[PDB]
Amino acid sequence: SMNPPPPETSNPNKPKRQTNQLQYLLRVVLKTLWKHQFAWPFQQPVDAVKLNLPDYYKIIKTPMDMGTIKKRLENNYYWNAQECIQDFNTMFTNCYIYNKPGDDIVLMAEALEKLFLQKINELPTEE
Ligand SMILES: COc1ccc2c(c1)C(c1ccc(Cl)cc1)=N[C@@H](CC(=O)Nc1ccc(N3CCC([N+](C)(C)C)CC3)cc1)c1nnc(C)n1-2
């Protein structure tokens, strides 16, 4: 039913960088999705208590959301772009696993994922 602790966004032991690709992921990819009309369900961890979803964290064992991704990018938590791309893909996949085709939340995830794919297609080569 209690929410779990959120995903990690701070860990001094983890080595960090700021690459041109990670800068693009913040300034282009995250900013584009965050401002969209369908962003709001994805701007923070799923609150299973307030939403009355007592089975959510039985089914979803690798939670992810754009609030967590925003904190990771603004904190320079990542070593490379692939780590961050994986977090976006985990967020979309969790939504499709929990819900059903044609549900409103699935239509919202599909619209955001289309934009994600259009932006990642022009990820710059690493300098
Ligand atoms: C802060 O609000 C959030 C956050 C995360 C998610 C959601 C909403 C939403 C969400 C849903 C629709 C729209 Cl338009 C937007 C969002 N979906 C949730 C998933 C959700 O809640 N599923 C859901 C489905 C059916 C019901 N029924 C309860 C019995 C009712 N009864 C009258 C007795 C017959 C019938 C309805 C209840 C819950 C979600 N999944 N990923 C994310 C992110 N989310």
UniProtKB/Swiss-Prot annotation:
Substituting residue 104 to G results in:
Found in a patient with a neurodevelopmental syndrome; uncertain significance
Tissue specificity of this protein? Ubiquitously expressed.
Q: Which domain of life is it from?
A: Eukaryota
Cross-linked residues, Glycyl lysine isopeptide (Lys-Gly) (interchain with G-Cter in SUMO2): 58
Q: Which residues form a coiled coil?
A: none
UniProt PTM = Phosphorylation by CK2 disrupt the intramolecular binding between the bromo domain 2 and the NPS region and promotes binding between the NPS and the BID regions, leading to activate the protein and promote binding to acetylated histones. In absence of phosphorylation, BRD4 does not localize to p53/TP53 target gene promoters, phosphorylation promoting recruitment to p53/TP53 target promoters.
Q: Which residues form the Bromo domain?
A: 17-123
Subcellular locations according to the entry: Nucleus; Chromosome
Q: Where is this site: Acetylated histone binding?
A: 99
Q: What does this protein do?
A: Chromatin reader protein that recognizes and binds acetylated histones and plays a key role in transmission of epigenetic memory across cell divisions and transcription regulation. Remains associated with acetylated chromatin throughout the entire cell cycle and provides epigenetic memory for postmitotic G1 gene transcription by preserving acetylated chromatin status and maintaining high-order chromatin structure. During interphase, plays a key role in regulating the transcription of signal-inducible genes by associating with the P-TEFb complex and recruiting it to promoters.
Task: Please give the family membership noted in the entry.
Answer: Belongs to the BET family.
Disorder noted: Cornelia de Lange syndrome 6: A form of Cornelia de Lange syndrome, a clinically heterogeneous developmental disorder associated with malformations affecting multiple systems. It is characterized by facial dysmorphisms, abnormal hands and feet, growth delay, cognitive retardation, hirsutism, gastroesophageal dysfunction and cardiac, ophthalmologic and genitourinary anomalies. CDLS6 inheritance is autosomal dominant. A chromosomal aberration involving BRD4 is found in a rare, aggressive, and lethal carcinoma arising in midline organs of young people. Translocation t(15;19)(q14;p13) with NUTM1 which produces a BRD4-NUTM1 fusion protein.
Query: What is known about its subunit structure?
Result: Interacts with p53/TP53; the interaction is direct. Interacts (via CTD region) with CDK9 and CCNT1, acting as an associated component of P-TEFb complex. Interacts with RELA (when acetylated at 'Lys-310'). Interacts (via NET domain) with NSD3, CHD4, BICRA and ATAD5. The interaction with BICRA bridges BRD4 to the GBAF complex. Interacts (via NET domain) with JMJD6 (via JmjC and N-terminal domains); the interaction is stronger in presence of ssRNA and recruits JMJD6 on distal enhancers. Interacts with NSD3. Interacts with NIPBL. (Microbial infection) Interacts with bovine papillomavirus type 1 regulatory protein E2. This interactions may serve for the tethering of viral genomes to host mitotic chromosomes allowing successful partitioning of the viral genome during cell division.
| Written domain comment of the UniProt record | The NET domain mediates interaction with a number of chromatin proteins involved in transcription regulation (NSD3, JMJD6, CHD4, GLTSCR1 and ATAD5). The C-terminal (CTD) region mediates interaction and recruitment of CDK9 and CCNT1 subunits of the P-TEFb complex. It is also required for maintenance of higher-order chromatin structure.
Q: What else is known?
A: JQ1, a thieno-triazolo-1,4-diazepine derivative, and I-BET, a benzodiazepine derivative, have been tested on tumors with success. Treatment with GSK1210151A (I-BET151, a I-BET derivative) has strong effets on mixed lineage leukemia and promotes myeloid differentiation and leukemia stem-cell depletion.
Its protein name is Bromodomain-containing protein 4
Q: Which organism is it from?
A: Homo sapiens (Human)
Q: From the entire protein, which fragment is shown?
A: 44 to 168 of 1362
